[PDB]
Write an enzyme that holds these catalytic residues in place. Sequence first.
Site, mmCIF file in Angstrom:
data_model
loop_
_atom_site.group_PDB
_atom_site.id
_atom_site.type_symbol
_atom_site.label_atom_id
_atom_site.label_comp_id
_atom_site.label_asym_id
_atom_site.label_seq_id
_atom_site.Cartn_x
_atom_site.Cartn_y
_atom_site.Cartn_z
ATOM 1 N N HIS A 1 0.693 -1.282 -0.063
ATOM 2 C CA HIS A 1 -0.090 -0.081 -0.088
ATOM 3 C C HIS A 1 0.805 1.176 0.077
ATOM 4 C CE1 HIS A 1 -3.675 2.168 1.421
ATOM 5 N NE2 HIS A 1 -2.821 3.099 1.923
ATOM 6 N N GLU A 2 1.989 1.200 0.960
ATOM 7 C CA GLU A 2 2.815 2.506 0.966
ATOM 8 C C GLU A 2 3.774 2.668 0.015
ATOM 9 O OE1 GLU A 2 0.950 3.217 4.161
ATOM 10 O OE2 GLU A 2 2.020 4.734 3.145
ATOM 11 N N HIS B 1 1.388 4.253 -2.858
ATOM 12 C CA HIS B 1 1.567 5.789 -2.433
ATOM 13 C C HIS B 1 2.936 6.419 -3.092
ATOM 14 C CE1 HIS B 1 -2.192 6.313 -0.598
ATOM 15 N NE2 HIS B 1 -1.734 5.915 0.675
ATOM 16 N N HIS C 1 -5.625 6.958 -2.641
ATOM 17 C CA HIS C 1 -6.689 6.153 -2.228
ATOM 18 C C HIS C 1 -7.804 5.747 -2.956
ATOM 19 C CE1 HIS C 1 -5.383 6.857 2.145
ATOM 20 N NE2 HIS C 1 -4.708 5.703 1.681
HETATM 21 ZN ZN LIG Z 1 -3.026 4.895 2.076
#
Ligand SMILES: [Zn+2]
Length: 357
Positions: free
Chosen positions: A308-309, A312, A318
Amino acid sequence: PVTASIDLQSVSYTDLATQLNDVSDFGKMIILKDNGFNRQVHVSMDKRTKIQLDNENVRLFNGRDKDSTNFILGDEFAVLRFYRNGESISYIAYKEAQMMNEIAEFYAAPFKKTRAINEKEAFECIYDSRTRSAGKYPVSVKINVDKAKKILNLPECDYINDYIKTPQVTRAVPSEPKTVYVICLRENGSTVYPNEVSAQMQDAANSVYAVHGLKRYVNLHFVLYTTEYACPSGNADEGLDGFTASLKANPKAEGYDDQIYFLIRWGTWDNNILGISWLNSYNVNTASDFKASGMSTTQLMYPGVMAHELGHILGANHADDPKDLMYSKYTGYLFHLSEKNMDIIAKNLGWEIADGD
Ligand SMILES: [Zn+2]
């Protein structure tokens, strides 16, 4: 020819190592058995991703998509993770008897707060029945992470505002994929567990490769060593500021300012925050100044946080779908579903739509 098999009622490190070390470049059929349960999987070496943990080489293996099965193998440990009834189950085996006992105690301990008769479906120490002497020490542990959270009544950790937006900075498919190092740094004073860290790295790497045939463009190389840096407070934002500053301030890191960096720990940050990153901070053409940095938990119960990171870092926002890796709340899914996010991530790694998938 009798098909190779792994008996999950007795699965040891030596079982997993002997079977996985026999996997050739053309792959190998392996039957996973668990009493009445039986699944044939086609296993192949993952040639896309390299991992060292403190210079210890860790190899990954994949099933077919339809097999829903991943393996990890180091000299010290091995992991089989697969899905049954839509739930992720890990078998974790350490080679050394004392380490395996330690790991089993570590995973067992949280379940001694509260006991259920279905506990075995969530967590089980596996013993070698082939040693008809009656093995005293377990040879692996089995953990159903989805079931485990339900028994433990965990305090639910989350992302909240887990990224920080920073100012923004011929072309074809490259002849060879570009090697991108993901330099993971064990926070000063953190203990991280090799099976846990490598699982986060595998899920992160696979989340990238699943998008727009990105293995053509990048091959991720994870390394782990320890940093003198530790976060000054419980706050994730302050922690990340200090971490990036620690990289820039370190003469040792000069000339590697274009790689990706994670501060890792086992625990979480204030407000039960799982990780944090600089948004849209890595691009293969312009990466610089340790901008492509973040922080991640590595604990087993939160698979996919590193993914997830890294999402980003590569520019993903998101997403609206609760089954997306990039959903704003932690939901345990491991793949990008957002076409907008997939396009952003892929472009930052050198892809354009004319290249196809
Ligand atoms: Zn996030």
